[PDB]
Amino acid sequence: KNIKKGPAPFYPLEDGTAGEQLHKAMKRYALVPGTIAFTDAHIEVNITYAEYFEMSVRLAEAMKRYGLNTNHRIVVCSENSLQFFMPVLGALFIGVAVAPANDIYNERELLNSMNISQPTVVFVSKKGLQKILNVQKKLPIIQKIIIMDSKTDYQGFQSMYTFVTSHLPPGFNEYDFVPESFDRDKTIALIMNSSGSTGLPKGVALPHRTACVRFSHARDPIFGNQIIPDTAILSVVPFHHGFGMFTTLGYLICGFRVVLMYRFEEELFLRSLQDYKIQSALLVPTLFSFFAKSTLIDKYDLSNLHEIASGGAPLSKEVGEAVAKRFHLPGIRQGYGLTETTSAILITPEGDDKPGAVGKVVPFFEAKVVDLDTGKTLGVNQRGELCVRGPMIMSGYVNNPEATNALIDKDGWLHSGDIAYWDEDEHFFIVDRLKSLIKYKGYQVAPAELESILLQHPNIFDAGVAGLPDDDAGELPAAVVVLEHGKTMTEKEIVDYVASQVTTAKKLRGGVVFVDEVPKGLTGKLDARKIREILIKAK
Ligand SMILES: Nc1ncnc2c1ncn2[C@@H]1O[C@H](COS(=O)(=O)NC(=O)c2csc(/C=C/c3nc4ccc(O)cc4s3)n2)[C@@H](O)[C@H]1O
């Protein structure tokens, strides 16, 4: 009754594995000559579905022969590049699971993912190699390091191109390759690294069944992208995380041109949007503060830009709208999701933008809000913990059944750990993450509200709210702030402005600290530890 179910899908769940469904598709677009799969903007290099389909099939077989099967895994440890999805596609076609890694990941972070992933073959960039060499000193499961962005054998490590030849038969056809068939409910497709709530990130295991459902959404005209061939998406989302991962595997399934960047550059992004004639952009919530400013957004012709999509972190109503105006759009096609749900299970329906809302329930899903204490399902406009269930939910946490039984309850409902509510026309609204909440004098103070309000001020460029520990008060809400070039506001001006918009309960009693950039988690997300350290060193 109060259970908000998603609709029927335009494109029903197609039979076979993620690997089989991906293959079938990239053969479609490869036999069509000239079709582009990935484009590099920094170096203006294209690469066709023929070149990609082939080099992915070559790696699939090359590995198949090397001796990997459904009882093996790998690592892909690279930043956004043309090379990244070749070994991803390779692995999915034979039933080897993939564990993406963060090129920026530090030594401990990296090791923890490796120890969980237990990778047989590790794919890495020339930048990333030396961290692998360091961590492989305690990782004896690893037999092979393969350099991704190279063509000749580098420092005794093979290239993907050399690895391929030294296993592929001389007389072999890429258009004759057949992908392995298996139990997609049982066979693990991906192993995602989480934010670990507060600790060493877990092993989020995602079956082939999940990706099969993800494709059904990406082909859906309302809940994704209408399959217009030779559409060009500009992705500036880290591929290792669910957002960049599952949006791209969807785009390959539709035959779109994925334009990508290794790092953000405001100067280029718009010229990329203009020159390549981009239809959909793929920013992360934190890049929005650079565009609500003004600058060059209508000094480049963004006439083609049909929309801007966002997720993987919160976005304030007033900043999301401020950007849609500047890009000359009806809104921001937001989405919400957990890595434990593969991809976004709440997506903004096409032509159904709702400012601060993330979106309605995607097909094959059921979303509901529960009474934080009693656990009963609440009705319209009622705030509480958001619970979701459908076929994109994880199978479990790698060697961690305890945390799995604490997140996913007995009827299969995943517990988000987020305060949400659903409005009259079923748009879902995330309030705040339950652990982000600042504890004042027995009060629950949401950082998303104080952020949303601070961000409305014209002199404020960007800001992040956190809980300065006190003693008497236990925790005072305080904010790290950024201004535009040539702007000033005294702390007391900012405080008194917050105070004039909120009750005494959630005043900014911890104060303000002025920074050049807000601690960003580089997955869109705002970093709490680094803010908490900034605020704590300032008092
Ligand atoms: N839209 C949020 N609004 C508040 N918060 C959030 C939100 N999205 C993610 N958190 C925060 O992230 C927490 C979990 O972190 S997480 O494991 O890294 N999950 C993700 O962030 C995540 C993984 S995949 C994924 C999918 C992203 C998208 N995929 C698409 C595809 C199409 C499209 O139009 C939009 C999107 S958005 N998100 C959530 O519990 C919540 O606090």
Numbering used by the authors: 5 to 543
Paste lines from the article.
In this work, we explored the possible structural interactions in the enzyme that may account for the near infrared emission of iLH2 and its application to dual-BLI in vivo.
First, the X-ray crystal structure of FLuc in complex with a high-energy intermediate analogue, 5’-O-[(N-dehydroinfraluciferyl)-sulfamoyl] adenosine (iDLSA) was determined to provide insight into the FLuc-iLH2 light-emitting reaction. The structures show good alignment to each other, however there is evidence of a more open active site supported by a reduction in root-mean-squared (RMSD) score when aligned based on just the N-terminal domain of FLuc rather than the entire structure (RMSD = 0.688 and 0.783 respectively). The altered position of the benzothiazole ring and the greater size of iDLSA may be the cause of a series of small active site changes that affect residues Glu311, Arg337, Asn338, Gly339, and Thr343 resulting in a total of six differences in H-bonding interactions. When specific residues implicated in the light emitting reaction were measured between the two structures differences ranged from 0.7 to 1.6 Å; with the biggest divergence being Lys529 (found in the C-terminal cap) which had a 2.4 Å difference in the nitrogen residue found in the side chain of the amino acid. Analysis of the x-ray crystal structure of FLuc in complex with the iLH2 analogue (iDLSA) revealed that the hydrogen-bonding network, thought to be critical in stabilising the phenolate ion of the emitter, is disrupted in the FLuc-iDLSA due to the accommodation of the larger iLH2 substrate. Evidence for the disruption of the network is the absence of a H-bond between Arg337 and Glu311 that is found in the DLSA structures of FLuc and L. cruciata Luc. It must be noted that the crystal structure reported here has captured FLuc in the adenylation step of the reaction, therefore further computational modelling/crystal structure elucidation would be expected to provide further information on the light-emitting step of the reaction with iLH2.
